[PDB]
């Protein structure tokens, strides 16, 4: 309704569940990893002035990061105070390691050391005040292997805020803005059913049209639904994209 | 004159560049002076006299008996032998003991330079046993340099009688 | 005596098992008994309570020397018996001790000269002390106990056992013999050792993982299976103690059948593990020998078993074997035993790369380092005492890789 005064949802997302299921065709270590759902968006005009190395906190109701995924928290000095707060909040099983910024800069200097730290956790969360430093220190070994630290605001440093922020951080999808006209957003996996997947799509679309696309949903060229190896089924096409680009330019 | 290979090896010392980089790491781990040790202890004394739990210290290991015991225990990561010990037989076995124990070792110049690191007039041998996590890469790069600039170099030269 | 009962009730032992029916009463009279029981029947209490009574009856003292000699085929079995005898002699004054292969022989000699009344020995080490150690008083020997006689014969201590009987006095000395199976060698040894006219009593999974990655694969596997029931078999109690201590130190709470070498705690821990729907328990093969295996989703053979014939019958939810590449010869023995098997494959990426952090934790802690050395040394000594010398050859084992699994940068200095 917001995008084009129409809602061609539900039917396409539900059909995609059967489309990937039909395309199904001893090991010791097993995991519940599922193929992600890639929501492709095309915009009429470029949406990024420059490479922004922070994710978008797209709040969602169906988390794309399972609660079994380990988390690593990066805080400002000293690390002992925030280590005590994490333990007192009951996040020991979630926030496994808390690394102070000075310790992260010093004790992890080699590329192999940075890669070992990167592979030791599934998601990285960072204090909002220390996020601008992580472009350095962490380097290309983090920002290209799908490991972008999350800007979690823990400024006041209290247990309830930590629990709310982590739950909010886990229950959200992220997308790193890049200068282009096309991008993909993680909407979920096959584990999430059709109705939950549809809810994730519309919530992301509202967030995208609000704080990502400068002119809103009117500037959306086309949108498609895709998986790792599935066909990019066209979710929706702008009925007036061709004339809008001609008139704008 | 003609010198045996075990004494001839001390004329082939570490190069100036690698030695200068070695002492940059060593100077981070100097033992605290007699004055600095007294200041730290008296500071804890006042905290006891009036009314009131640390980490393990970090420093470079020195002393001939101490270092040889650390090599035999395989506790030493890098052993730096003075090139001009007045009785040479004091350190004439150290390159062989370091080879047997797999300890990266180098023969550096000016035993006085070694003593300056430890606030002493003179040191026959210095040994780095275990450093802070910040300097793991710096020590690792030095050990690789000592392998190439001292062990890969010479080596075939250290088995030949020098002089003559 | 009341001291025996006060010690027994400390272990939480009530009533009295079936094999002890034909052994404990007649043996209390000082008559030779030819016992024969299966694994786990409780023979440890069978030949210890009457003998301990006889120490108290004769008022033996360390100046008298050794009065009872107990022979066990392996280090772990002898150590387990020594742990039980320590519990039974809690309220006593008769000295007890153990001599085993691969142990400090000089330290054992200093302990033997002081006077050990109840000696638990191995056939290899006992012959060395009986011939060479000076000041070892054993002329007052009064009781002799042999446990798992068939195991001793199959190991290759027939020659050693013959010299023991020729050296040890035979007059007015009570003798015992316990064997699961009665073979020609067992009968021949009984005829030359026991007194005339005795009272006779009557699917597999494996992972080919290198030594250095043995623990890292295990730790990652336990993290994955935190929502199941896991029971792990080890080659020693010291190895059990260290891994249980280390796992609790890296936020992986586990249970072990070691406790503080207290028999009551082991039964309590096993009872709690059986009652609990989910959990993880570590124990050695000898501790689990003859016990009742509950409904466990995963059974793990972290270390190779010392009795392959008993293990292949004990297995008959899922079975796992941590087999080193140098131990791949055990696969051929499985075919000769006609047992179906499958190979488990794991990706190197999923294995936890915590080895560098593991070494730092062990080096920084005194008790972790002390436990790690004891576990490493005992694991090697148990390895050298394996029956399958051809398959589990200690020389072929890479000691540098093994010590990496225990959290050591370099292999510690352990003898044999």
From TrEMBL, chain C:
Domain Helicase C-terminal: start-end pairs: 203-362
GO cellular component: nucleolus
GO terms, molecular function: ATP binding; hydrolase activity; RNA binding; RNA helicase activity
Domain of life of the native organism: Eukaryota
Motif (Q motif): 1-21
Domain called DEAD-box RNA helicase Q: residue spans: 1-21
Gene (name only): has1
Enzyme Commission number, as recorded: 3.6.4.13
Keywords: ATP-binding, Helicase, Hydrolase, Nucleotide-binding, Nucleus, Ribosome biogenesis, RNA-binding, rRNA processing
The protein's enzyme class: hydrolase
Family membership: Belongs to the DEAD box helicase family. DDX18/HAS1 subfamily.
Gene Ontology BP, a term: rRNA processing
Subcellular location(s) of the protein: Nucleus, Nucleolus
Protein name listed in UniProt: ATP-dependent RNA helicase
Catalytic activity annotation: ATP + H2O = ADP + phosphate + H(+)
Residues of the full protein shown: 97 to 534 of 578
Predominant cellular place of this UniProt entry's protein: nucleus
């Amino acid at each position: 309704e917001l995008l084009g005064s129409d809602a061609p949802l539900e039917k396409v997302c539900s059909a995609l569940l059967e489309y990937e299921s039909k395309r199904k065709s001893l090991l010791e270590d097993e995991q519940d990893d599922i193929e992600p759902v890639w929501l492709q968006l095309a915009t009429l005009k470029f949406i990024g002035n420059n490479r922004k190395l922070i994710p978008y906190k797209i709040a969602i109701k169906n988390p794309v990061i399972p609660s079994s995924s380990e988390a690593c928290l990066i805080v400002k000095d000293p690390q002992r105070v925030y280590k005590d707060l994490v333990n007192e909040a009951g996040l020991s099983k979630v926030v496994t390691r808390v690394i102070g910024l000075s310790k992260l800069k010093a004790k992890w200097n080699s590329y192999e050391q940075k890669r070992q730290l990167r592979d030791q956790f599934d998601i990285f969360l960072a204090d909002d005040r220390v996020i601008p430093m992580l472009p350095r220190i962490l380097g290309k070994t983090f920002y290209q292997k799908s490991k972008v630290p999350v800007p979690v605001k823990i400024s006041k440093g209290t247990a309830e805020q930590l629990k709310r922020e982590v739950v909010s951080a886990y229950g959200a999808t992220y997308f790193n803005s890049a200068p282009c006209s096309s991008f993909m957003i993680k909407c979920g996996h096959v584990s999430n059913t059709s109705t939950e997947l549809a809810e994730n799509v519309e919530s992301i679309l509202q967030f995208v049209s609000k704080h990502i696309v400068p002119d809103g949903a009117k500037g959306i060229a086309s949108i498609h639904l895709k998986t790792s190896q599935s066909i990019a089924i066209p979710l929706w096409n702008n009925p007036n994209l061709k004339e809008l680009i001609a008139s704008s330019r | 004159l003609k010198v045996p290979p075990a004494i001839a090896q001390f004329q082939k010392t570490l190069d100036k560049n690698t030695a200068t980089q070695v002492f940059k790491l060593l100077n981070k781990y100097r033992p605290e002076t007699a004055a600095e040790k007294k200041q730290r202890l008296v500071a804890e004394a006042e905290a006891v006299a009036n009314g009131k739990v640390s980490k393990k210290p970090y420093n470079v290991k020195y002393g001939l008996n101490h270092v040889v015991a650390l090599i035999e225990a395989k506790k030493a990561k890098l052993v730096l032998i003075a090139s001009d010990v007045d009785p040479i037989e004091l350190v004439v076995f150290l390159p062989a003991l370091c080879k047997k124990m797999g300890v990266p070792y180098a023969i550096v110049k000016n035993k006085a330079r070694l003593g300056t690191v430890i606030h002493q007039k003179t040191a026959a041998v210095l040994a780095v046993t275990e450093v802070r996590e910040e300097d793991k890469n710096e020590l690792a790069s030095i050990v690789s340099a000592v392998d190439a600039n001292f062990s890969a170099k010479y080596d075939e030269s250290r088995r030949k009688w020098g002089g003559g | 005596s009341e001291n025996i009962q006060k010690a027994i009730k400390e272990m939480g032992f009530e009533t009295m098992t079936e094999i002890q029916k034909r052994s404990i009463p007649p043996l209390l009279a000082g008559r030779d008994v030819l016992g024969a029981a299966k694994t786990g029947s409780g023979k440890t209490l069978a030949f210890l309570i009457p003998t301990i009574e006889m120490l108290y009856a004769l008022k033996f003292k360390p100046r008298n020397g050794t009065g009872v000699i107990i022979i066990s085929p392996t280090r772990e079995l002898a150590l387990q018996i020594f742990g039980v005898a320590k519990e039974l002699l809690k309220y006593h004054h008769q000295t007890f001790g153990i001599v085993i292969g691969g142990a400090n022989r000089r330290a054992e000699a200093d302990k033997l000269v002081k006077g050990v009344n109840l000696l638990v020995a191995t056939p290899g080490r006992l012959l060395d002390h009986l011939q060479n150690t000076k000041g070892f008083v054993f002329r007052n020997l009064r009781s002799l106990v042999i446990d798992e006689a068939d195991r001793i014969l199959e190991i290759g201590f027939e020659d050693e056992m013959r010299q023991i009987m020729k050296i040890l006095p035979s007059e007015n000395r009570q003798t015992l013999l316990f064997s699961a199976t009665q073979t020609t060698k067992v009968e021949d040894l009984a005829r030359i050792s026991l007194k005339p006219g005795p009272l006779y009593v009557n699917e597999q999974g494996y992972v080919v993982v290198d030594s250095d990655k043995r623990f890292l694969l295990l730790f990652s596997f336990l993290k994955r299976n935190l929502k199941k029931k896991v029971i792990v078999f080890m080659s020693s109690c010291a190895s059990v103690k260290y891994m249980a201590e280390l796992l609790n130190y890296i936020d992986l709470p586990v249970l072990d059948l070691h406790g503080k070498q207290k028999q009551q705690r082991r039964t309590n821990t096993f009872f709690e593990f059986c009652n609990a729907e989910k959990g993880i328990l570590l124990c050695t093969n000898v501790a689990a020998r003859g016990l009742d295996i509950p409904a466990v989703d995963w059974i793990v053979q972290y270390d190779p078993p010392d009795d392959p014939r008993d293990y292949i019958h004990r297995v008959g939810g899922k079975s796992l074997m941590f087999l080193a590449p140098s131990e791949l010869g055990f696969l051929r023995y499985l075919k000769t035993a006609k047992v179906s098997l499958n190979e488990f494959e794991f990706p190197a990426n999923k294995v936890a790369n915590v080895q560098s952090q593991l070494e730092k934790l062990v080096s920084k802690n005194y008790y972790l380092q002390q436990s790690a050395k004891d576990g490493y040394r005992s694991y090697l000594q148990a390895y050298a005492s394996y029956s399958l010398k051809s398959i589990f050859d200690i020389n072929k084992l890479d000691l540098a890789k093994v010590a990496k699994s225990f959290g050591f940068a370099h292999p510690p200095n352990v003898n044999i």
